[PDB]
Design a protein around this ligand. Structure first.
Ligand SMILES: Nc1ncnc2c1ncn2[C@@H]1O[C@H](CSCC[C@H](N)C(=O)O)[C@@H](O)[C@H]1O
Ligand SMILES: C[n+]1cccc(C(N)=O)c1
Length: 252
């Protein structure tokens, strides 16, 4: 199973963005964006602080979220990935072009702003960029942070967790960052055992709906929403059966 080490040496953040975020990849990103819209815009989910866990080099998962949460902390294990994110934050020439994705979100949200203004609201929202390891009982390190109103994690936990016990423990580690009554939002692959960035292979925990749901409940959360798309990534990308999106509340 892919080690943390392999992420630092061999996960190329720009290639990942080229592979997935420029087909099945399109159809899945469309669906994830519509779920995020639903969760952050239509549903309750609101607050002062959202912490995004395993952000990678991506910002798509934060586009509707910056409308509901004053402040966003982005986090990942790989500093190389956070640096790729930071290129976008700082509006650098070589930064990835999220404009097609941003426009789609603006569309979903009733065209009340244009892309530029939406991007400026996300850049304004992101307050800290920090290191994170979900396998650590203190995932963000030795210094305390304020407790979050929401924890967001997209396509991270299956890749971070080599087995079911570690998966449960990661949910409890992350819970320590969340205030009681805080929301846990997870989107991840279903029954996937690997994914690809070009020729480089990464492991995935092949988890099913029942296993995900039982694990989230055991870790001390209620499930408010669980939704499945049974769309696999392209044949050279992953062997997932589909993707899930769950919303949970930490117990009070
Ligand atoms: N132990 C760990 N703790 C936190 N993040 C980890 C981790 N192991 C791997 N990761 C990170 O998990 C991410 C998976 S790629 C997911 C990126 C993004 N959230 C998206 O939705 O596309 C990578 O950025 C990788 O560095
Ligand atoms: C980061 N990522 C992207 C696509 C699929 C997977 C997976 N866990 O199968 C992970």
């Amino acid at each position: 199973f892919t080690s943390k080490d392999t992420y630092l040496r061999h996960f190329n953040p720009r290639d990942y963005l080229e592979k997935y975020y420029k087909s099945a990849e399109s159809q899945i990103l469309k669906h994830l964006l519509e779920n995020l819209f639903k969760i952050f815009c239509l549903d309750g989910v609101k607050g002062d602080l959202l912490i995004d866990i395993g952000s990678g080099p991506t910002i798509y998962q934060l586009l509707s979220a910056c409308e509901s949460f004053k402040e966003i902390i982005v986090t990942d294990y790989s500093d190389q990935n956070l640096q790729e994110l930071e290129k976008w934050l700082k509006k650098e020439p070589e930064a990835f072009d999220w404009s097609p994705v941003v426009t789609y979100v603006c569309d979903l949200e009733g065209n009340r702003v244009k892309g530029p203004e939406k991007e400026e609201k996300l850049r304004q929202a992101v307050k800290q960029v920090l290191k994170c390891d979900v396998t650590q009982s203190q995932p963000l390190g030795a210094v305390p942070l304020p407790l979050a109103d929401c924890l967001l994690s997209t396509l991270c936990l299956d890749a971070a967790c080599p087995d079911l016990p570690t998966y449960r423990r990661a949910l409890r580690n992350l819970g320590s960052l969340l205030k009681p009554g805080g929301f846990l939002v997870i989107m991840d692959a279903l029954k996937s055992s690997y994914y690809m960035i070009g020729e480089q292979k990464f492991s995935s925990l092949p988890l099913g709906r029942e296993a995900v749901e039982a694990a989230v409940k055991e870790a001390g959360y209620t499930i408010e929403w669980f939704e499945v798309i049974s769309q696999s990534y392209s044949s050279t990308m992953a062997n997932n059966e589909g993707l899930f999106s769950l919303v949970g509340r930490k117990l009070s």
